[PDB]
Symmetry: C2
Subunit: 545 residues, 2 copies
């Protein structure tokens, strides 16, 4: 469009207290390894090469994927589901779309598999394939089973199995949250589960008499000739944990380990410092030092006990010298720092490696190949961005309001710290009341703040509006003299969010008062994701001053 | 070549009415079958007016009139215009929440106060001198929470009571809620700053962690002020409780006997089960006797609700300090005695039906029955009534999965045992065109049963949408020689979709499917199954 808004730069600054208080020594790295909304981690290995994937729901693209040689220094190589033929979330609810993924390398045929559930596009349970994740992946192959959290296991004899969560057979459900682990034989030439090979291997969980919730996230491992089934149990919230079973046969019977769970923060004191909660949904791999490691998700709530940055990806070393794997210190409070594997230096945030700790990301929009952390919601960023020849992000304003279950012209960045600032310079002259551009903080189309520049009657106004249950209310408004680009900032200090603007570039004026991050939490908004910070443009603005 | 639905027949066949035939001077409970939640009632003279919540249905707040509490005439919807109701993009569980209707004798004016989570409205009130004609645009009120209600004292002084959350950081437990009262400025139609006061904290007994104290109503009897509230949430723990005070703003004291309306303690294996009873509102009947309307559900054999929360009524004894719902703590009976001297005329002379009725729609009037609604947008946007009868539906380029108005004429499921049959005259041009029947909890939980064209041939398709993911269950090639009849039949949780090319023999497409995704228990939310005459030009089903 002519006169479309131009965001000339962005600065995202993280300022979390835990990192300032626990500076790294050489040979240490911070946990979580993926800060912000990177849930349901799954990991696999080919030779020296590790690949890590996470769920993504309605975000576009889907299933972010990271590569590492050492489990500390990760390079985001893209997204597994990065084409509209693989990811059909145009109209998808904020809590539907792409659920937990599992990634597995099959050494028998030298093929990588990513198996997941996509509640969109008619996909359901799907698998995509690649010989080389750096080349991308196939279109999805639909798989003939229901439920969530599929995982694929390749036995030494080349035989293949898919385990997944499912419900109990119709009418046998004993309580709310009563779930089942089901296994199939998988035909590797057909890419399909084999009819008549399904079998329930876990009913309920470790101890059915305690009514375990949502036994899920199954993975099968083979070690010392035996078969291990590791699962999440308790649901991905306050009761999250990881449990383990063992069998002599891929299809059971599986017996729970006497010590269970093997990973959890759910029993720990609710007032601890540097709190890590909801820990579970793990996946094991052999590390570069011969040691095992497990990735898993957890949250780091703020001072009001809520999560605003979603479920994040953690890692812990694993001792598997005996019958059952032990998450090292996986049942006591998580520490901020871990020792790097033997002989690896921490290079996070350098040389294209994903950052960690308290970093400052300065985005000047000087290349068409935008950082992979810039995403869309429901639709691809390439539909509304242009990188100007001399730098700067021009956003085509879609006639789509932030409240619509439709792709908006908003370039989003996951909130990755409980204390952060996100500042942008906006060059923009709105022409009528329907035009707005600025910053948005989004849990969903129904739960968000919009902080932006609009024009009404003769004047330009900065507006701050709050959407709750899909109902937008204007919180505060200010007439501004738009004589030059305006800078806009959102600053979060735990649950305290401040929206401020600067016409002189130095002094940021608070618009209204500090507002609560409550609608930016999973606890209030519901769902499966974190706060997304967005460079928003619309030609369907409904705010009036 | 738009699809023409030439006829619809809706038939209810619930066993409870067959087993309990009416005698003279009897009528069936609920008085509004199907999704008519959060009832509120008021009176002017001999004229009763009854309203219900409606969420994202269009139009909003259906409103009924009666002279006798038995024979009701739907007179329209309070939130009738797109200037009053802005649910175009609204989630299935947002939109219009509980309404309260109150006639003010002091200024001869009707008020309807509600919460609309859409269009920037929030808590709103509309006014009318004559509900038969219509109401004002919404007046926005400066408070948060839900379930507002307006009370007019003897001296004309006015109060708004509503549900709210506890003070920021005061929250004791999940579900901890508060009843708050304001003085209301009747000249400016606004709550008066600084007059807000919490009058109930939590519920009858805060030490029992009561959840979602809500639906507050204030009544004045014998000089004392009564606050009647729902407690326990609108699900399995629903109930109604009562408090008393000497003053409008408290302190309010709970009655020793509480709750006074509930089915939550009753045996889970009872027959003709009524559950989730609460959210009541009292009125003086033509009897001189009091009555209370309230919502409840009637689950099927799987223990699920597919027809939503319905409107019930009970006689109320208020000869002593506190109102008593007559038999409101024992299992609900299918039949009640009419107030003294009123005969049952339900389903006749334009009165709303009840029992097991047969609704035959021939689309031979431009004045379409008020039970035909849209979801998110008005029906007038996509319907034309043909000259010699028939409903022509303009197919919108909108899929059933979108949070947008679709071209679908919807009818609430009103029975656990029912059939809905239509005659479809339609020749689809491409894969993108489909017309037929849909059963909808929401855009994310529905069945679509429709006629499609793919390659050179016509197909009937049955597709299931769960969590916004559509899967094709079954397909049949059909010779489209003449119009086709489509039926969905529900027998509790058993739903059968069948088509007839000869008009007599209906062939099942696929197997019977579960109504689980048509229940509130599975799909979540606040509403019932909607049965729709659907057309689209953005069909995504492929054979």
């Amino acid at each position: 469009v002519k006169g479309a808004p131009v965001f000339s730069q962005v600065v995202y600054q993280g300022n979390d207290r835990v990192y300032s208080e626990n500076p790294l020594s050489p040979g240490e790295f911070y946990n979580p390894i993926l800060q912000g909304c990177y849930p349901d981690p799954s990991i696999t290995r080919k030779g020296d090469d590790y690949f890590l994937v996470c769920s993504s729901f309605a975000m576009f693209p889907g299933v972010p994927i990271f590569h590492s040689k050492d489990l500390v220094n990760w390079t985001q190589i893209g997204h597994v589901l990065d084409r509209t033929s693989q990811l059909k979330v145009h109209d998808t609810g904020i809590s539907a779309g792409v659920y937990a993924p599992a990634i597995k390398y099959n050494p028998n045929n030298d093929t990588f598999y990513m198996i997941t559930t996509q509640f969109a596009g008619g996909f359901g349970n799907i698998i995509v394939k690649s010989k080389d994740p750096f080349k991308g992946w196939s279109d999805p192959i639909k798989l003939n089973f229901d439920g969530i959290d599929p995982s694929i296991f390749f036995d030494d004899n080349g035989k293949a199995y898919v385990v997944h969560n499912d419900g109990p057979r119709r009418g046998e459900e004993l309580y709310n949250g009563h779930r089942v682990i089901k296994i199939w034989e998988y035909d590797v030439e057909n890419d399909q589960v084999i009819p008549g090979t399904d079998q329930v291997i876990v009913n309920g969980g470790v101890d059915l008499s305690k009514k375990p919730i949502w036994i899920e996230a199954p993975h099968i491992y083979k070690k010392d000739g035996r078969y291990y089934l590791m699962c999440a149990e308790g649901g991905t919230g306050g009761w999250h944990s990881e449990v383990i079973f063992v069998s002599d046969n891929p299809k059971g019977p599986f017996i729970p380990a006497p010590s269970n769970p093997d990973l959890s923060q759910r029993y720990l004191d609710h007032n601890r410092k540097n709190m890590v909660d909801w820990a579970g949904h793990a996946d094991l791999v052999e590390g570069p030092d011969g040691k095992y490691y497990g990735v898993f998700l957890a949250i780091r709530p703020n001072e009001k006990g809520r999560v605003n940055i979603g479920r994040e990806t953690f890692i812990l070393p694993v001792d598997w010298s005996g019958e059952f794997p032990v998450f090292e210190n996986g049942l006591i409070p998580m520490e901020p720092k871990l020792k790097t594997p033997a002989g690896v230096e921490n290079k996070t945030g350098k040389d294209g490696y994903f950052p960690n700790g308290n970093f400052t990301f300065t985005e000047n929009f000087t290349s068409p190949q935008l950082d992979y952390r810039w995403i869309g919601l429901r639709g691809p960023r390439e539909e509304f961005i242009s990188i100007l020849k001399d730098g700067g992000l021009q956003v085509t304003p879609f006639p789509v309001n932030i409240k619509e279950v439709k792709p908006t012209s908003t370039l989003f960045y996951r909130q990755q710290h409980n204390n952060f600032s996100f500042t942008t310079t906006l060059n923009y002259t709105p022409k009528t009341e329907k035009d707005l551009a600025g910053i948005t903080c989004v849990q969903s189309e129904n739960f968000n703040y919009v902080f932006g520049l609009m024009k009404q009657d003769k004047d330009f106004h900065m507006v701050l509006a709050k959407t709750e249950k899909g109902n937008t209310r204007l919180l505060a408004s200010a007439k501004v003299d738009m004589k030059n680009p305006i800078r806009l900032q959102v600053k979060g200090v735990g649950d305290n969010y401040d929206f401020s603007y600067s016409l002189d570039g130095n002094n940021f004026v608070l618009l209204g008062n500090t507002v609560s991050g409550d609608i930016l939490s999973t606890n209030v908004a519901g769902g499966f994701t974190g706060c997304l910070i967005g460079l928003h443009a619309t030609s369907a603005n409904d705010i009036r001053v």
